Amino acid sequence: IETVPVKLKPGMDGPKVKQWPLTEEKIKALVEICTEMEKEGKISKIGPENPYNTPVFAIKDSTKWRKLVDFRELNKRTQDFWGIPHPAGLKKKKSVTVLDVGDAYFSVPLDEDFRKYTAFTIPSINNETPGIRYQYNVLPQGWKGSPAIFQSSMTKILEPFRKQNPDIVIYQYMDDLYVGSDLEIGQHRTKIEELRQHLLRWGLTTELHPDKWTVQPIVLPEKDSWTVNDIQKLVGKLNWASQIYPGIKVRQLCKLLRGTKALTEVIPLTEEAELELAENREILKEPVHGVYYDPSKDLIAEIQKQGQGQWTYQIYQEPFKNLKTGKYARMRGAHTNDVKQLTEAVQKITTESIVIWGKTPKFKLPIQKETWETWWTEYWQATWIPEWEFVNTPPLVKLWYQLEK
Amino acid sequence: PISPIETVPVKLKPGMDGPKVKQWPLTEEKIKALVEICTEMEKEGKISKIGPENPYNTPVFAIKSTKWRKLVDFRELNKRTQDFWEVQLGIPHPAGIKKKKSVTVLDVGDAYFSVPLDEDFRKYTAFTIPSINNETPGIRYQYNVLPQGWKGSPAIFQSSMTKILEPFRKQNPDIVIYQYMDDLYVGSDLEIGQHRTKIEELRQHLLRWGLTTPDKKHQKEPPFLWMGYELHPDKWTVQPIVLPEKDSWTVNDIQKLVGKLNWASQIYPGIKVRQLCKLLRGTKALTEVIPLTEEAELELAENREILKEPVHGVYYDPSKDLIAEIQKQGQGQWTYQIYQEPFKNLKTGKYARMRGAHTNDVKQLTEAVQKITTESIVIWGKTPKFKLPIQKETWETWWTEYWQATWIPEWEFVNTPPLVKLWYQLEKEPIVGAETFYVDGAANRETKLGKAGYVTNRGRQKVVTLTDTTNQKTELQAIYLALQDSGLEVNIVTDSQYALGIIQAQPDQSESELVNQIIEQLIKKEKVYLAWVPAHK
Ligand SMILES: CCC(=O)NS(=O)(=O)c1ccc(NC(=O)COc2ccc(Cl)cc2C(=O)c2cc(Cl)cc(C#N)c2)c(C)c1
């Protein structure tokens, strides 16, 4: 077709992110994939007068490798195109399926003036040789500008299946398509092939249940007898929960902690303490009132390492005002790898944010930058990449959330 | 001699214009010598005599072969030239090179001058040869080729070189060619006569594109003296390092000596600089003279002997295993050797004391493993199998319950003491039968006095006033007293947020003298339970 002019944001220069080192196997796969793309005119080699750069790497499913480009920096510096809105229905469905449509993009030429900004580098081993430089001639996968510039074409190709199915909902984000229905699994799945074959007919491809993502309740411990230690730990968590629910009281329990009693000594709960403990439980039976999502604010996702393979998390915009909270557990075959578990949690959580709000949250990761950067790619599978920062989990937040039900 | 090579389109930074600095007048000698040179360059088609038009200009100097040599200061032009793709700053490491039957090193002589400049950019490199008598115009020239000392030259030359080799590489898949600055290191497993034949092929393919080169005699022969190493065909070694010998050492002398010694620590084992570093205390000037103590003398004398040791390396075989072994030489200091077979090291190294506010040996080991791993992927595009001095249970007991995500690639245990262990472990529950200390601390952060103390269920109490102290310090000192005055088992109640940190991390090393004292005391107890409780009424 033709190319629509595209610019960076005022005063923004192009990305110059350094390429991280890669294993011999990933380099060989990238060399193979790129020599093919070059032959088809998708990408071309470039000269030294191009100083920009975006990092690239290689992910899997079983046999072949897929190329993944991190255009996070280019995306930020890329102008705005205000894409489609967000169907408040998609999130309310019953079953959503994700489809990779990145192949669609290779058929549309990228404005020649913008091409240089997509430069990337395949590194070598031991510095033996300079990297192999390339830039895109066509809409690249992962750049926010692609889905947008292909919108008119995507609506045109989805219209028939859409008019045919007034009920089902389709929502697009980056390279993926999120389709949901209320049908019956069998009819749902087979109804997807109908869509895929329709996509196959142009060039595109060769289970999530939103009605289960519900904020979890904090349940307090229950005991036959209570020791001084028991009462101190209960009082510490409640003292924190008060930051969320102002009606929680600890005066009665705290009165039971006067004196200097051995930590193991048993203390009889007075009637007052009894009531106070009961009012607090009653308050905790529901999420706190007043929390609503603001579109002019960033979405934040925090994760704590609970141990024994469990990982808790919260999504919010303002402190103590959670939009969603949950617990993700280690799955079959990760019993010795924290990194693999964290990457699985991030993707799962990022996916959830997309379905509900149409954007990805900013993550606070309880891991060291070096440890994360050296291995996160080993287990990534999404076409997209969220933003992230590394933190130092406060001992309390952790203690309170493992109290979840 | 010039090349048929396509030119690279170059541009000036957004907005600014070509340079216009005036020509620094020179004597009649230096002028006549420049005229000589610039006349020969005109013959070779390297520069072009120009006229009126060109408004730009760059200063030209004359320096001294015992003759004169041209020098053009492009400092200004450079700051007006666009940015280019960063020329690589990584240097291959001999531990990651594959052994070859034959190796020929070729340096492209007059690299730069041999490559054409973007025709639309030449005008910006105009310079002027003065004249004895002023007021007379002077000779005007501009560059037709990559100028020596110009910002873009290294990058444009490297790129060109790459384009010219692509075909040859595609035709000879088994041949390996290293590119470094304007040097090619070519290697094969062909029989010496065949190799020499393929080399001459390459040489003529380069000559074809204008790049001239060293033939068989006017060359370089092994062992090759490259970046501080000596490469032989069956192995490699490091160029011997020499420590001066004087009766009078200045502060500067000591700092350079300390540096060389520090570097040598990667390769040699027992290199020490403690007593020599002690020499810099309170120094008042670089040129100051510091007499050497006995210790410092012995230290230095001992290092000279170590440096005369034959440390050699071996090259990489992609058919054998890659293995790395680690040792804890001291708190926070580790040594490592990466090898393929017992006693044949590919490379060695040492990570200096990584101190801080607080960590634990198991943590530092983890970081050493990650640094070595990032290093291995760069060198060999692969991760080694580790041999760590730590019980599988210690690891499993730490990572299992540590608040931070952590991991070690595929490894194996090796009982080569001292092993890395957990120095202590807080109880998961209160201790039945052990005294319970209720500790508190507070102090005027202004007067820096204040106090901290405890009171137990058994009746024991105490309070100490601290002159010139702080908040966190009173809290910590509180905990410290309890640990000191208690028996082999204890329960400790504190409202300190910091102790809460000690619960989540359980460190064994720290900057703070206090924390240290606490750690020492925590390691002594047989059982310790630490509990945190909110402060206010
Ligand atoms: C008397 C026998 C003899 O010396 N044989 S030989 O042909 O000269 C020969 C053959 C291989 C080797 N070397 C090897 O096997 C391993 O080394 C190499 C393996 C492959 C390649 Cl392409 C180069 C080298 C280098 O020695 C080398 C590397 C770098 Cl980055 C700079 C310089 C630099 N500068 C040299 C040597 C040192 C000499």
Side-chain angles (χ1 to χ4, degrees):
Chain A
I1 310 182
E2 279 292 354
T3 68
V4 56
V6 186
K7 299 179 294 190
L8 288 179
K9 298 178 183 185
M12 298 287 130
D13 185 32
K16 286 120 160 297
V17 192
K18 69 172 57 61
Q19 167 61 50
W20 42 78
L22 300 181
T23 58
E24 200 171 14
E25 266 117 338
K26 297 197 209 301
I27 295 163
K28 279 181 169 66
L30 289 168
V31 167
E32 251 186 55
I33 294 169
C34 286
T35 53
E36 241 283 79
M37 279 164 94
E38 182 190 7
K39 291 299 154 296
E40 302 170 44
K42 295 178 185 168
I43 57 167
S44 304
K45 298 202 163 185
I46 58 175
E49 79 279 20
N50 180 325
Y52 307 108
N53 191 245
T54 295
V56 316
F57 53 95
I59 57 186
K60 286 294 183 178
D61 201 4
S62 63
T63 299
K64 255 61 166 167
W65 303 76
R66 184 178 192 292
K67 167 215 212 61
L68 178 57
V69 183
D70 176 3
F71 286 114
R72 268 180 300 165
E73 285 308 290
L74 181 57
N75 297 321
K76 291 170 186 174
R77 313 181 187 203
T78 289
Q79 83 183 186
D80 317 65
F81 301 97
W82 307 151
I84 56 172
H86 186 61
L90 174 58
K91 81 204 64 168
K92 293 182 293 184
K93 272 291 179 261
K94 173 209 170 184
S95 283
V96 185
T97 300
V98 189
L99 303 178
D100 189 354
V101 300
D103 304 282
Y105 299 139
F106 97 75
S107 64
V108 192
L110 174 72
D111 183 65
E112 68 188 3
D113 291 320
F114 199 75
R115 286 178 175 125
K116 59 179 173 180
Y117 299 134
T118 67
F120 67 87
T121 310
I122 300 186
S124 73
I125 301 168
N126 199 25
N127 271 81
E128 150 182 349
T129 272
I132 313 165
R133 309 261 292 161
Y134 291 111
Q135 74 174 46
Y136 278 73
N137 289 131
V138 305
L139 295 172
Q141 303 194 66
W143 173 54
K144 79 166 173 179
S146 304
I149 291 180
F150 182 80
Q151 194 50 284
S152 67
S153 301
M154 178 64 73
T155 156
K156 171 175 283 58
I157 70 178
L158 293 183
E159 177 180 294
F161 189 86
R162 273 174 177 168
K163 269 63 179 186
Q164 297 177 56
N165 300 282
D167 48 311
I168 291 173
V169 171
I170 297 172
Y171 166 52
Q172 187 183 187
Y173 186 77
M174 296 286 97
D175 306 356
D176 307 310
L177 238 49
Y178 293 85
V179 298
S181 74
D182 319 78
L183 305 183
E184 158 53 356
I185 185 63
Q187 307 182 189
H188 176 75
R189 300 187 185 179
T190 53
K191 195 65 173 175
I192 299 291
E193 252 294 307
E194 181 178 306
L195 171 56
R196 206 162 73 180
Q197 286 194 180
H198 184 177
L199 279 338
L200 282 164
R201 186 187 172 64
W202 295 63
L204 284 158
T205 6
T206 51
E207 301 291 3
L208 292 165
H209 307 98
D211 61 304
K212 82 192 303 298
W213 302 334
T214 56
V215 177
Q216 289 307 308
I218 306 299
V219 304
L220 306 164
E222 203 73 74
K223 300 177 183 298
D224 284 340
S225 291
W226 291 80
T227 71
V228 164
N229 180 241
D230 284 346
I231 290 169
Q232 289 174 343
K233 286 194 294 181
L234 172 58
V235 148
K237 291 161 190 180
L238 297 175
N239 184 64
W240 193 81
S242 50
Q243 298 176 290
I244 298 185
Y245 301 94
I248 301 174
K249 299 289 203 297
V250 294
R251 61 200 192 303
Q252 304 308 153
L253 293 179
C254 276
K255 287 186 178 304
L256 309 160
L257 263 24
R258 310 207 182 211
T260 78
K261 298 171 178 184
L263 251 55
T264 41
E265 176 167 312
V266 175
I267 308 298
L269 293 190
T270 71
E271 286 280 337
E272 291 67 63
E274 293 283 14
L275 179 66
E276 178 170 296
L277 225 197
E279 288 196 35
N280 295 336
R281 290 178 197 294
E282 202 58 38
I283 282 153
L284 293 172
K285 279 182 175 301
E286 296 182 4
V288 74
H289 302 163
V291 186
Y292 296 105
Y293 166 96
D294 179 336
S296 82
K297 298 166 156 300
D298 290 323
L299 233 36
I300 296 171
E302 200 193 316
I303 303 176
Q304 303 78 43
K305 173 178 175 185
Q306 293 291 167
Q308 298 293 294
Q310 295 101 54
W311 303 73
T312 51
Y313 70 97
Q314 306 81 50
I315 302 179
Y316 63 89
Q317 301 181 300
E318 297 296 336
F320 309 94
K321 301 167 191 180
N322 303 321
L323 291 162
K324 237 95 181 176
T325 67
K327 180 201 302 296
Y328 175 85
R330 170 186 86 71
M331 62 175 77
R332 192 174 188 174
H335 45 293
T336 12
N337 193 320
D338 277 348
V339 174
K340 185 174 189 178
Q341 287 168 49
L342 230 218
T343 55
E344 294 179 290
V346 173
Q347 297 173 81
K348 191 175 193 70
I349 296 173
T350 295
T351 309
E352 182 181 341
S353 303
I354 289 179
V355 165
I356 301 173
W357 305 288
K359 48 194 293 187
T360 56
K362 165 64 176 183
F363 289 80
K364 287 179 182 299
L365 304 179
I367 187 184
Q368 190 181 319
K369 178 188 173 70
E370 287 63 56
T371 300
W372 180 253
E373 292 179 358
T374 287
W375 296 298
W376 76 272
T377 45
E378 291 308 301
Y379 331 86
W380 198 258
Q381 299 146 302
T383 53
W384 40 251
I385 302 174
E387 308 296 339
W388 57 53
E389 80 185 59
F390 319 85
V391 306
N392 298 292
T393 298
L396 271 168
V397 173
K398 180 282 186 184
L399 265 33
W400 190 68
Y401 286 111
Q402 70 175 302
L403 231 46
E404 181 156 297
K405 176 191 179 63
Chain B
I2 258 179
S3 303
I5 319 172
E6 184 68 58
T7 57
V8 167
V10 179
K11 281 175 169 286
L12 284 177
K13 291 188 177 176
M16 44 221 278
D17 199 10
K20 291 170 178 173
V21 35
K22 70 177 301 174
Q23 181 52 55
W24 208 310
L26 313 132
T27 69
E28 46 82 53
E29 187 188 7
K30 299 176 172 184
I31 294 181
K32 213 45 57 188
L34 286 169
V35 171
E36 191 82 298
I37 302 177
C38 291
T39 283
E40 156 67 356
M41 290 189 164
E42 175 157 56
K43 271 267 68 171
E44 301 170 299
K46 299 173 62 294
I47 50 184
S48 283
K49 196 162 61 178
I50 50 183
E53 211 307 305
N54 204 300
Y56 318 108
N57 186 274
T58 304
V60 54
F61 294 109
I63 69 178
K64 44 192 169 183
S65 173
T66 308
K67 82 149 80 65
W68 291 114
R69 316 188 76 68
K70 191 175 87 308
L71 184 70
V72 182
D73 195 11
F74 285 114
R75 286 185 291 175
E76 268 308 295
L77 176 64
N78 290 351
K79 60 176 69 178
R80 290 184 172 59
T81 292
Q82 72 171 94
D83 284 71
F84 299 92
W85 181 47
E86 52 100 290
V87 197
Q88 254 315 298
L89 297 174
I91 318 306
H93 183 112
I97 301 185
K98 304 159 170 174
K99 183 175 179 305
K100 282 293 188 303
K101 288 191 177 300
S102 294
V103 168
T104 305
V105 353
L106 297 51
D107 65 279
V108 194
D110 43 305
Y112 305 165
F113 287 169
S114 183
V115 184
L117 220 233
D118 175 31
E119 36 290 273
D120 280 312
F121 196 78
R122 302 185 187 182
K123 51 185 183 61
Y124 297 128
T125 69
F127 65 93
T128 292
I129 293 186
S131 189
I132 323 79
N133 332 345
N134 273 313
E135 291 277 1
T136 171
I139 327 297
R140 295 282 291 165
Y141 291 126
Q142 70 168 42
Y143 276 86
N144 302 302
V145 303
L146 265 43
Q148 284 180 59
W150 176 60
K151 181 182 179 188
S153 301
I156 298 176
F157 176 90
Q158 171 159 85
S159 174
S160 293
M161 178 56 113
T162 296
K163 279 187 283 178
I164 294 174
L165 295 175
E166 282 182 291
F168 186 86
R169 290 175 176 282
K170 230 108 80 299
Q171 304 158 190
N172 303 276
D174 55 300
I175 293 187
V176 180
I177 301 173
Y178 289 12
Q179 257 166 286
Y180 178 99
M181 288 213 264
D182 47 65
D183 267 41
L184 299 182
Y185 306 127
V186 190
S188 71
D189 279 321
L190 299 183
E191 220 306 289
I192 150 183
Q194 236 296 72
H195 177 85
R196 179 239 311 161
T197 302
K198 271 292 178 185
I199 290 312
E200 185 52 35
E201 190 181 315
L202 207 209
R203 237 165 68 54
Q204 227 181 177
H205 172 235
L206 284 167
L207 203 310
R208 185 178 175 297
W209 292 89
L211 306 185
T212 64
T213 242
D215 75 78
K216 311 84 176 192
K217 34 237 187 174
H218 79 84
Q219 263 208 198
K220 273 177 191 161
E221 297 296 334
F224 306 119
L225 293 305
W226 185 73
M227 310 291 102
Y229 305 80
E230 287 188 353
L231 309 310
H232 303 274
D234 57 333
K235 45 77 176 183
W236 56 279
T237 59
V238 189
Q239 297 172 187
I241 319 178
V242 295
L243 303 176
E245 182 53 83
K246 309 186 297 181
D247 295 69
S248 181
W249 306 79
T250 59
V251 167
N252 237 172
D253 295 322
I254 294 176
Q255 292 186 303
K256 300 183 181 293
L257 172 64
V258 169
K260 272 179 185 171
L261 261 21
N262 194 282
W263 144 275
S265 279
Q266 293 303 304
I267 296 169
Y268 301 84
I271 294 294
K272 292 171 181 167
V273 296
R274 198 174 202 280
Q275 305 293 162
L276 290 175
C277 219
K278 300 234 301 179
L279 275 48
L280 294 328
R281 304 188 174 193
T283 45
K284 66 188 185 175
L286 284 305
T287 52
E288 180 179 12
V289 179
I290 290 61
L292 277 56
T293 60
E294 195 174 303
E295 291 68 33
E297 205 71 59
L298 181 39
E299 193 170 76
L300 174 54
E302 288 169 296
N303 285 335
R304 288 181 191 293
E305 282 306 84
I306 282 181
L307 283 176
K308 295 196 298 185
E309 268 179 280
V311 299
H312 77 288
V314 166
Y315 300 117
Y316 184 55
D317 178 1
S319 172
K320 305 185 186 179
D321 292 340
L322 235 191
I323 302 164
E325 195 179 303
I326 302 179
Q327 299 85 42
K328 178 168 129 59
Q329 167 174 291
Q331 185 183 59
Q333 287 183 175
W334 315 80
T335 60
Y336 71 76
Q337 36 277 173
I338 303 181
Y339 60 84
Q340 297 205 277
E341 62 190 315
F343 309 157
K344 293 192 176 184
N345 296 315
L346 286 184
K347 154 178 181 57
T348 62
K350 154 183 178 173
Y351 299 134
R353 152 59 76 68
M354 181 143 89
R355 66 296 172 294
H358 51 293
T359 44
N360 62 64
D361 283 359
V362 180
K363 219 300 172 183
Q364 294 202 314
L365 196 248
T366 283
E367 308 172 312
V369 175
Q370 83 88 8
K371 293 207 226 61
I372 293 176
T373 298
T374 290
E375 195 174 304
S376 295
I377 288 172
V378 169
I379 304 299
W380 305 277
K382 171 185 179 178
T383 306
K385 307 204 306 294
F386 292 89
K387 288 176 57 182
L388 313 172
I390 187 181
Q391 288 286 310
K392 282 282 182 188
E393 265 60 67
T394 287
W395 172 240
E396 196 85 12
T397 291
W398 186 73
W399 135 55
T400 202
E401 261 74 65
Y402 192 56
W403 68 275
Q404 196 174 70
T406 187
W407 185 63
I408 297 181
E410 182 228 308
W411 66 284
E412 170 197 1
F413 175 63
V414 72
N415 195 317
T416 303
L419 306 190
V420 300
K421 62 176 177 173
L422 300 154
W423 292 86
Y424 67 94
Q425 274 171 57
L426 308 181
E427 295 303 297
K428 299 190 178 70
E429 299 291 320
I431 312 164
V432 189
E435 193 168 4
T436 290
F437 285 62
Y438 283 74
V439 309
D440 195 11
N444 200 295
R445 57 286 119 207
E446 288 175 47
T447 68
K448 246 136 72 62
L449 278 142
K451 37 204 174 180
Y454 61 64
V455 68
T456 85
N457 63 299
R458 300 192 182 179
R460 178 144 44 190
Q461 39 167 49
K462 165 180 295 186
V463 173
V464 182
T465 32
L466 301 174
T467 70
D468 200 51
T469 188
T470 65
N471 199 191
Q472 77 148 188
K473 292 193 177 184
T474 45
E475 290 181 350
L476 303 170
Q477 187 74 44
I479 296 173
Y480 183 62
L481 291 173
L483 295 167
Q484 288 186 300
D485 306 342
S486 60
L488 297 182
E489 302 194 323
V490 235
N491 298 300
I492 305 184
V493 181
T494 188
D495 69 319
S496 168
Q497 264 87 185
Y498 263 67
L500 198 61
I502 292 164
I503 293 168
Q504 187 181 57
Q506 300 177 53
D508 67 67
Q509 80 165 72
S510 182
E511 59 177 311
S512 170
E513 184 57 52
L514 238 192
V515 173
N516 259 303
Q517 288 167 45
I518 300 176
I519 292 176
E520 285 309 306
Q521 280 301 313
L522 281 168
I523 285 177
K524 291 173 184 172
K525 308 294 179 175
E526 304 216 66
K527 291 189 180 177
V528 183
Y529 184 65
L530 166 55
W532 174 77
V533 189
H536 309 301
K537 333 140 80 67

